[PDB]
RNA sequence: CUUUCU
RNA sequence: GUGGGAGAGGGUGGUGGAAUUCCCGGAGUAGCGGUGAAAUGCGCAGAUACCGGGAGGAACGCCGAUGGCGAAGGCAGCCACCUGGUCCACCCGUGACGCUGAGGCGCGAAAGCGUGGGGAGCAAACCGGAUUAGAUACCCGGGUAGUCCACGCCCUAAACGAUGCGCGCUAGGUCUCUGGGUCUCCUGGGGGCCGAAGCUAACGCGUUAAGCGCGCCGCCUGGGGAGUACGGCCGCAAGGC
Ligand SMILES: CN[C@H]1C[C@@H](N)[C@H](O)[C@@H](O[C@@H]2O[C@H](CO)[C@H](O)[C@@H]3O[C@@]4(O[C@@H]([C@@H](N)CO)[C@H](O)[C@@H](O)[C@H]4O)O[C@@H]23)[C@@H]1O
Ligand SMILES: [Mg+2]
Ligand SMILES: [Mg+2]
Ligand SMILES: [Mg+2]
Ligand SMILES: [Mg+2]
Ligand SMILES: [Mg+2]
Ligand SMILES: [Mg+2]
Ligand SMILES: [Mg+2]
């Protein structure tokens with residue numbers, strides 16, 4: 145289904161241009177440093193597109209992950 | 218001129234003197250290139266998502282400047298010279314594009 | 319780039335009368351401005367062919383406006399050329 | 407002959423064979439097994455059955471160093487990966503956790519013709 | 526695996 | 532002109548992590564690899580699998596699309612500088628200044644050429660294994676040019692939407708990207724699908740025309756011989772026109 149409730153929903157208004165709110169950004173990555181698909185991130189073409197650049201900036205700053213190990217399996 | 222944001226992360230193992238020193242050269246370096254500080258934030262230490270120069274934490278700095286654009290790239294050549302400065306990142310400032318607001 | 323000052327500073331400098339934003343003298347003026355900066359940028363970045371097209375475009379648009387000028391008022395023309403510093 | 411107990415179990419599964427390497431709490435391998443380790447010589451090597459006999463052997467051999475608590479780290483999808491995991495889960499060793507850590511490039515080198523025709 | 530000709 | 536907007540459009544520099552290869556160190560043994568089976572190959576000078584360190588080259592996962600940008604070729608990690616195109620709103624300025632375009636000049640994927648540099652992975656040729664009746668192949672193991680960079684040359688292509696450019700006119704419906712608005716929809720630009728009229732040999736096209744008209748360019752005139760001969764021009768050559 146993928147309808148585990150959008151990520152934009154469970155979250156208040158936030159600046160998407162801010163590449164340091166590791167608290168909020170952390171939210172758009174899966175059980176790995178992977179940027180969630182629109183149909184999960186709940187974002188929009190423009191939004192989503194900006195988010196993605198915001199998330200990449202972070203990573204470089206070391207604030208956000210590039211990739212995580214998968215627990216279970 | 219133009220408005221930028223300079224992110225600087227350095228060795229989390231700096232004693233009051235060493236640390237307060239790097240900022241000396243930074244503050245200096247900024248000036249030497251036309252950087253006019255509009256304000257600063259110092260979050261300090263933060264658990265990096267992954268190790269940087271073997272070190273699993275980092276000391277963050279944040280300066281918002283206004284300086285001759287034609288020298289932003291040089292300003293940061295300088296900033297990276299330091300051995301404790303392990304990550305420098307300048308950014309054009311931008312309106313805080315909201316969302317879900 | 320060209321600041322709003324840089325620009326308007328030229329517009330007034332050529333405008334046929336207060337408010338003349340797009341006469342032929344003006345247009346030829348602003349174009350000569352861009353064409354110079356651009357041809358300046360290409361003095362270097364010779365490999366930047368894409369930007370070069372834009373040059374050819376402006377260069378066209380320009381002589382095409384001058385052509386019209388030198389046709390309507392041969393005087394305003396010689397005036398504009400000697401001034402802007404075109405031909406050579 | 408060291409006595410470890412708590413440790414890591416690395417399962418390197420591939421469609422060509424499975425190899426298990428049990429190690430200490432910080433990397434250095436203790437004992438390793440594989441398809442070849444046990445009889446199986448060629449094609450048979452890959453099989454999930456071997457993936458078992460290998461896991462077990464790895465553990466048995468590891469039981470000698472006095473193993474017990476182990477953390478499984480799977481690497482690569484292949485003929486009998488889940489099988490190795492189950493084998494360990496049995497054996498004796500207590501499987502504390504399991505984690506996919508298979509490596510994936512962020513698009514680095516051009517794969518052999520063998521694995522191209524992607525994009 | 527391949528696996529021609531009529 | 533003023534005010535905004537989106538964008539992998541282009542150029543120079545810088546920089547981030549994933550992975551591969553190599554080298555060093557540890558721990559650790561008897562195999563690893565590879566296939567349909569195998570073998571060559573690598574491994575006790577200790578390989579594979581595991582951990583830590585280093586070097587180097589090249590590409591840039593998720594986001595990513597059914598998306599976007601460019602005139603085309605084509606363009607995607609991040610950052611900054613330089614820079615092209617383009618769209619919307621206000622309707623403010625000039626006052627037909629317009630369109631097309633033989634020749635010209637420029638651009639032009641890949642392979643290829645010249646000088647120099649670089650070389651991790653991949654890999655024409657080539658050296659081997661296997662398969663086969665044979666195997667100058669498919670499969671497996673190696674591997675040189677090359678792929679990378681600079682400067683210069685080459686100028687071709689299923690260089691494709693196989694659909695020249697500009698303008699006007701002719702139902703709608705739906706999805707989408709981007710701008711404006713009185714923002715459960717209206718309006719402008721762009722990308723898709725279904726479809727009125729109409730068009731078409733059919734397939735199909737259908738406000739993104741392949742419909743109705745006007746302007747200008749290129750081109751076709753049965754198949755083979757043949758993109759060959761010859762001549763001329765260009766090219767270092769291969770070769771191109
Ligand atoms: C006319 N000149 C030649 C042209 C050849 N290309 C052809 O293979 C020859 O012979 C026959 O040609 C036919 C059309 O090309 C065909 O397809 C026959 O199949 C053939 O049958 C077998 C023979 N036992 C009989 O010729 C062999 O497998 C081959 O020669 C094989 O091509 O003969 C073939 C023929 O004579
Ligand atoms: Mg622009
Ligand atoms: Mg008016
Ligand atoms: Mg008038
Ligand atoms: Mg070319
Ligand atoms: Mg090439
Ligand atoms: Mg060469
Ligand atoms: Mg080969």
Ligand SMILES: [Mg+2]
Pocket residue numbers: none
């Ligand atoms: Mg090879």
Ligand SMILES: [Mg+2]
Pocket residue numbers: none
């Ligand atoms: Mg439309």
Ligand SMILES: [Mg+2]
Pocket residue numbers: none
């Ligand atoms: Mg009909």
Ligand SMILES: [Mg+2]
Pocket residue numbers: 737
């Ligand atoms: Mg249709």
Ligand SMILES: [Mg+2]
Pocket residue numbers: none
């Ligand atoms: Mg000649």
